[PDB]
Design a protein around this ligand. Structure first.
Ligand SMILES: [Zn+2]
Ligand SMILES: [Zn+2]
Length: 413
């Protein structure tokens, strides 16, 4: 007898005999789990690690939320699926255009491919914009798909989400967007879906709210992972094959005095090339954001026609804190990104620095606590833990976070 599989974006996924789950722990620097385990707070993950397969994996660069979630969802890098930031800039038009709409997704998700093959599929996110992206191609007329966010759980309908009011269904209020509870809702929905819906494929993804605010091992960080472990214990107890991974890690990005440590790329380019001759883009978040949530460790820049790219790159790389500077072609090959949605040059900052645009009218910082962020090579390493014996499972740099569903269904088969 031939084995059953689903082929998606050039990869063959065996059909899962038991439910196959990937959990994306947003911003989960491996140190978070080590600290919580060491404090005795994750007895289930501790045991799961001992008896399963424990690895580190590499995220996509940029180590941002959307590109990495979409990579996990499609099993492919952004060169394939097209989502490589929150927005891009169009030199013609002079327009900044949001890349977080499903129309910009260029490759099918694993979720749609399994759904189209007759599977039961469930996707739960914390934020609703990612929900719409992740849910592209799912259908809700056969009772075989569920897709909603904690954020808009009370707005779910049968026809568009596969469930009527997921808040009422789960029996928990809609959580505050800026809370651990937004992510707890996802875990809780996941458990209830596993019991009652019995998906063949399920993705659970959260937000990095806690991780931007709190370093590994501090009480609030430990409490979050203590909470996760309870849901993990339950998913594991119900017999699912589970991969726990992350979209990206998290590192402190502040000076000794606790203030943000930023390299203002637009200021530098204005000086060398003329004011606004170039455009620096900060794709970590939406373009309107100026409140320190716009500070990450990866940036891209669009340069005036004719200028000396090679020269400009050398000038940027000479700056302390700027670790990597690549032209479009090279950055796209190295990081597996789409040339048509990346700037002329790509910049990656050092471990404890971020990249900003300018101090002209500035980038007024919001929250109090010392800056923590992601986007660079120093937030690329993430946990990758499976609750099954898989001695052949590769390790980083070969293992990618977007191998999560490949190995989950393999373990489930
Ligand atoms: Zn994230
Ligand atoms: Zn973040």
């Amino acid at each position: 007898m031939s084995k059953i599989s689903v082929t998606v974006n050039g990869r063959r996924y065996p059909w899962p005999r038991v439910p196959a789950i990937a959990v994306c722990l947003d911003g989960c620097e491996p140190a978070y789990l080590d600290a919580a385990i060491d404090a005795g707070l994750m007895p289930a993950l501790k045991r799961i690690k001992e008896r399963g397969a424990v690895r580190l994996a590499h995220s996509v660069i940029p180590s941002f939320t959307n590109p990495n979630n979409l990579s996990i969802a499609t099993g492919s890098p952004p060169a394939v699926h097209g989502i490589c930031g929150n927005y891009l800039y169009e030199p013609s038009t002079g327009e900044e255009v949001m890349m977080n709409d499903p129309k910009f997704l260029r490759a099918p998700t694993i979720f749609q491919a399994f759904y189209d093959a007759g599977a039961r599929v469930a996707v739960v996110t914390a934020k609703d914009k990612l929900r719409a992206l992740l849910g592209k191609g799912l259908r809700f007329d056969e009772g075989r798909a569920v897709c909603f966010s904690s954020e808009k759980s009370d707005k779910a309908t049968r026809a568009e989400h596969g469930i009527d009011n997921a808040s009422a269904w789960l029996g928990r209020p809609v959580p505050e967007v800026y809370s651990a509870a937004l992510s707890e809702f996802v875990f809780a929905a996941g458990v209830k879906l596993l019991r009652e819906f019995r998906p063949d494929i399920m993705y659970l993804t959260t937000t990095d709210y806690v991780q931007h605010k709190y370093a590994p091992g501090v009480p609030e960080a430990n409490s979050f992972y203590e909470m996760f472990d309870r849901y993990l214990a339950e998913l594991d107890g119900l017999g699912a094959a589970i991969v726990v991974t992350a979209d990206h890690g998290m590192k402190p990005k502040h000076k000794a005095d606790g203030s943000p440590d930023v390299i203002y790329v637009q200021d530098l380019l204005d000086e060398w090339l003329g004011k606004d001759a170039a455009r620096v883009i900060l794709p970590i978040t939406d373009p309107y954001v100026v409140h320190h949530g716009a500070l990450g460790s990866f940036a891209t820049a669009y340069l005036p026609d004719g200028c000396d790219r090679s020269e400009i790159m050398a000038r940027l790389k000479a700056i302390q804190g700027v670790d990597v500077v690549l032209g479009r072609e090279e950055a796209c090959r190295r990081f597996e990104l789409p040339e048509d949605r990346i700037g002329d040059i790509v910049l990656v900052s050092s471990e404890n620095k971020t990249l900003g645009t300018s101090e002209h009218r500035h980038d007024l910082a919001a929250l109090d606590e010392p800056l923590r962020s992601h986007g660079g090579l120093t937030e690329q390493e993430v946990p990758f833990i499976v609750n099954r014996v898989l001695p052949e499972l590769p390790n980083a740099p070969r293992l990618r976070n977007f191998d999560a569903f490949f190995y989950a269904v393999t373990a489930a088969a």
